């Protein structure tokens, strides 16, 4: 009943609310990962920083979806944000393998929303996802793959040198 | 004879582009009318005038960008009469903005219909042109007009004066 | 019944509304001319630019008349803007001959409005037209005449060189 | 096994810090909800939106500072679900700010309860951390919210519009 | 042994990307040939040479961006021979630009065919990549080549000299 | 007809210049393949990728300078197919750099053979062109590749990672 709502399906509106929740859950997971690597008994500041920066990127992704929801005349509906899947994240390689799986899951959710937009002929939604999400996800997944290949190469002394010489401080 | 440049450009899309030019010029003309109406001595809402005069220029630029697209794809611009605006007098700010919102939703629907035609004819250059330069601009403008109407309803007159003074740009 | 209206005849008010329409029709004609010369099969960018600049000048002329109408307490009344007289404009020389005829017609309409102002003793109108329209029209008609003389001189290779060496890009 | 750094840091304070993290994240999430609610086209109070969006970030920073403290003292961060906000729709500015004031007083009481626990366990580093970074910030924010509610009551609507225009930052 | 990163990236798209890399390299090589031909002492049209040399670099950049895309999606670049250009001598400016326009329309058709494959395989990242970096670039270049050919026909030699002096950049 | 400018320029040198253009283009293409191989997600040695991508551009510039020389002397550029690179996958950094060193020594031998032909045909402008723009560049590049291989052998993997991080430019 929004005065502005036009060509905006209830199915897309609900899927947007679910994708907000998925972004907030990813942000929360990266917050957990970020602080884990700053424990005195882990102490990999570059790994901490990498995950803390991703926590902020995923939260910005959620906020952009909420702005889209308001711009199209849908109604934001919030759900609980589930705690992250682990309390302790293991070595850098295991943490980045978990991050890569979570990003591929988020990318699949974005591609599923794009498919719904295409099926409901909502080209504003298609363009929003292509402009702000799909290439960002491809570039981030590629960067995580590159990191995992280098962590496998240096496999520990190798994990220290990866944090010192690849990751930003 | 067919343009030396024309490629993957349907005659139906070419004709629809010419109609969208006319719809943009008609919207521009309506906003010009609205703009000067609010600058009458017996209406005298300069911020409302300015809002509509800026939209008259934005819709004219939308028309010009479509004409450039028509030339870039090798179609032929065909102009029709630009119909005079639907009203001579536009009433209070709220009634004028309700008219503007209906006009923008109509223009948005015309853009979405052209996008559907492009998608059916597999003209991805057209789809990307509309998505890049029109569809998000229409969403943002319709949202801003909605916000304005909610605030005009809230202040409903003294409220109309304060809206023009404290929300609209001069 | 305007609180401001003074020495402003209904005849002048109606003639101002007609001159607005004539300026908008001239603007629309120049818009058509401007895009015609940017067709891939015409491709005279300087001629396109010349007409696009005139489209904006004629629209500004209409807007100035509307501001005058409001300043004097008249009421703007809009009519349909008739489509331009041609869909295709021929060579540069033929297009500029059509433009010169249209400007002389607009100049005659301005001189007719000045005559009406003089007959109705509306010196504010006389001064408005003299300050903002009559000399502009004389200078533009002179410039169009100069252009036509040069297009006749170079009469094609000549039309190309005129666009390259006389017209602005 | 106990951290190599842990010193004078009770397991009860460690657990209370984890709960205060969750309370700050829940407050952040509530303010995010409030922030986007006031930017709906049918609410359209941008200054109210901005006020709550800025508080969402301040509460998230409060959570992050507590997690840094947990690591600095050799405790272990343990995360729980962040409960969704108590409302989906927040009503007029005054009702939303009354909800925010009650949430801030609840958070302030949680901080004061943690300070009492620190004082009982003689953890002066914790007492000073809360005093330096939380307790005065909560006092100042609660005072500002009180001032806002007094002005919203004064202008009680046209008054709600003028409060958003003339008191709140854009 | 499927890439750790590969997601929603069909073997058909992967193969078509490798073919489009080869088509871009062949276009680059053709423009290199055109560029040096116009700088022969017995042709000596520096502006025409520069036009084609710049296009050789643009088409090579197009190939490199496709190879970066292939790596970003987890596909594997497979290179083939780059076929020598279709002519050794390119005739007058007008004949060379007619051959260039035919080659660009062929490349644009290959880009549109890849977009159709992306649309059929629901690979929206591919669709957006082509729309953002290739399809509008091709439309604008084809339009520019059409404009050039119209002016070369107009001045048809002394005309070809004046076109190179007064239209083309040095 | 002979060029109006051609002087002291043998048909043998003209043909050998055309072959050396093709050899430079094939070396460029090989380095392009190496450059993208090392940017695969499952190789991910950005400094190695950068090293080869920079060489791809240097070899292409070498080809372009030979084509400019061909035109300056009044010869006629004749292009052949550019053969695809000898491998699709290049192995570890050390194996790729061993393949690059063998390819550069082959290119250096072709440059020395062209110099010998110039000396035999008493073409001192050719001799000076090769000495000034090619022979010292090849010696310096081969020396740098030898240095790289010695360091890759020293650090032989963790060593390969550290070489890319601490020796190669990003």
> Could you tell me the two tokens for F150?
């010695």
Mutate to test the interface with A, among B122, B135, B149 (most CBs of A within 10 A): B135
Does A111 contact E128 at a Cβ distance shorter than 8 Å? no
Q: Identify whether the C-beta of residue D118 lies closer than 8 Å to the C-beta of residue D130.
A: yes
Closest CA to C89 of C30, C138, C148: C30
Tell me the torsion sign for CA atoms C107, C113, C115, C118. negative
Distance in angstroms (rounded) separating the CA atoms of residues D73 and A35? 13
Measure B73 CA to nearest chain E CA, in Å: 7
- How far is Cα of residue D111 from the mean position of the Cα atoms in its chain? 10
Query: CB contact, 8 Å: A112 with chain E?
Result: no
Distance in angstroms (rounded) separating the CA atoms of residues D120 and B72? 78
Distance in angstroms (rounded) separating the CA atoms of residues D143 and D141? 5
Query: CB contact, 8 Å: D161 with chain A?
Result: no
Measure A144 CA to nearest chain F CA, in Å: 9
Closest residue, chain C, to B74 (C-alpha): C40
Closest residue, chain E, to F67 (C-alpha): E36
B104 among the known binding-site residues? yes
Of A2, A38, A84, the CB nearest to D79: A84
Distance in angstroms (rounded) separating the CA atoms of residues E132 and F107? 39
Q: Identify whether the C-beta of residue A143 lies closer than 8 Å to the C-beta of residue F148.
A: no
Strand partners, F82: E82
Closest residue, chain E, to C40 (C-alpha): E147
Q: Identify whether the C-beta of residue C50 lies closer than 8 Å to the C-beta of residue C167.
A: yes
Does B125 contact E135 at a Cβ distance shorter than 8 Å? yes
Name chain B contacts of A73, Cβ cutoff 8 Å: 143, 146
**Which class for C123: exposed (0-12), middle (13-18), buried (19 or more C-beta within 10 A)?**
exposed
Structural method: X-ray
Of C41, C63, C82, the CB nearest to B3: C41
Neighbours of A10 (CB within 10 A): 9
Instruction: Give the single-character DSSP code of B136.
Output: H
- How far is Cα of residue B65 from the mean position of the Cα atoms in its chain? 13
* A-F contacts at Cβ under 8 angstroms: 34
Chains C and D touch (3+ CB pairs under 8 A): no
Of C40, C70, C83, the CB nearest to B36: C70
Chains linked to C by 3 or more Cβ pairs within 8 Å: B, E
**Which class for A82: exposed (0-12), middle (13-18), buried (19 or more C-beta within 10 A)?**
middle
Only one residue has tokens 């695809």, namely F84
Instruction: Give the single-character DSSP code of D42.
Output: T
Of E72, E122, E124, the CB nearest to A142: E72
Q: Identify whether the C-beta of residue F154 lies closer than 8 Å to the C-beta of residue F35.
A: no
Does B36 contact C82 at a Cβ distance shorter than 8 Å? no
Measure D94 CA to nearest chain B CA, in Å: 15
Neighbours of F125 (CB within 10 A): 14
Q: Which residues contact F32 (CB under 8 A, 6 or more apart)?
A: E64, E67, E79, F52, F53, F56
User: CA–CA distance from E81 to each of C36, E21, E29, E53, F36 (Å)?
Assistant: 44, 11, 12, 21, 17
**Angle at A98 (CA atoms; ends A97, A101), nearest 5 degrees:** 85
3-state helix, strand, coil in chain A (%, to 5): 75, 0, 25
Q: Could you give the 3-state DSSP secondary structure of residue A81?
A: strand
Distance in angstroms (rounded) separating the CA atoms of residues A54 and A95? 13
Q: Identify whether the C-beta of residue C161 lies closer than 8 Å to the C-beta of residue C47.
A: no
Does C41 contact E150 at a Cβ distance shorter than 8 Å? yes
Of E135, E140, E145, the CB nearest to B128: E135
How long, in residues, is chain D? 170
Query: CB contact, 8 Å: B39 with chain C?
Result: yes
> Could you tell me the two tokens for A81?
């944000």
Q: Identify whether the C-beta of residue B87 lies closer than 8 Å to the C-beta of residue B99.
A: yes
Q: Identify whether the C-beta of residue D76 lies closer than 8 Å to the C-beta of residue D14.
A: yes
Name chain B contacts of D42, Cβ cutoff 8 Å: 146, 150
Name chain B contacts of E122, Cβ cutoff 8 Å: none
Query: CB contact, 8 Å: E151 with chain C?
Result: yes
Of C43, C156, C164, the CB nearest to E150: C43
Tell me the torsion sign for CA atoms E137, E143, E147, E148. positive
Measure E79 CA to nearest chain F CA, in Å: 6
Chains F and D touch (3+ CB pairs under 8 A): no
Does D43 contact B150 at a Cβ distance shorter than 8 Å? yes
Name chain B contacts of E139, Cβ cutoff 8 Å: 72-73, 125
Distance in angstroms (rounded) separating the CA atoms of residues B153 and B93? 10
Query: CB contact, 8 Å: B4 with chain C?
Result: yes
Q: Identify whether the C-beta of residue C47 lies closer than 8 Å to the C-beta of residue C99.
A: no
Query: CB contact, 8 Å: A63 with chain D?
Result: yes
> Could you tell me the two tokens for C106?
């607009």
């Amino acid at each position: 009943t929004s005065q502005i709502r036009q060509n905006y399906s209830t199915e897309v509106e609900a899927a947007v609310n679910r994708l907000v929740n998925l972004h907030l859950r990813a942000s929360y997971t990266y917050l957990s990962l970020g602080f884990f690597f700053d424990r005195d008994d882990v102490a990999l500041e570059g790994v901490g920083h990498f995950f803390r920066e991703l926590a902020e990127e995923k939260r910005e992704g959620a906020e952009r979806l909420l702005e889209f929801q308001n711009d199209r005349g849908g109604r934001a509906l919030f759900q609980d944000v589930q705690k992250p899947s682990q309390d302790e994240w293991g070595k850098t390689q295991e943490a980045m393998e978990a991050a890569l799986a979570m990003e591929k899951n988020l990318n699949q959710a974005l591609l599923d929303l794009h498919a719904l937009g295409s099926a409901r002929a909502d080209p504003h939604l298609c363009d929003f996802l292509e402009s702000h999400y799909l290439d960002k996800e491809v570039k981030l997944i590629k960067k995580m793959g590159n990191h995992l290949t280098n962590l496998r190469r240096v496999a520990s002394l190798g994990e220290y040198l990866f944090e010192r010489l690849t990751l930003k401080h």
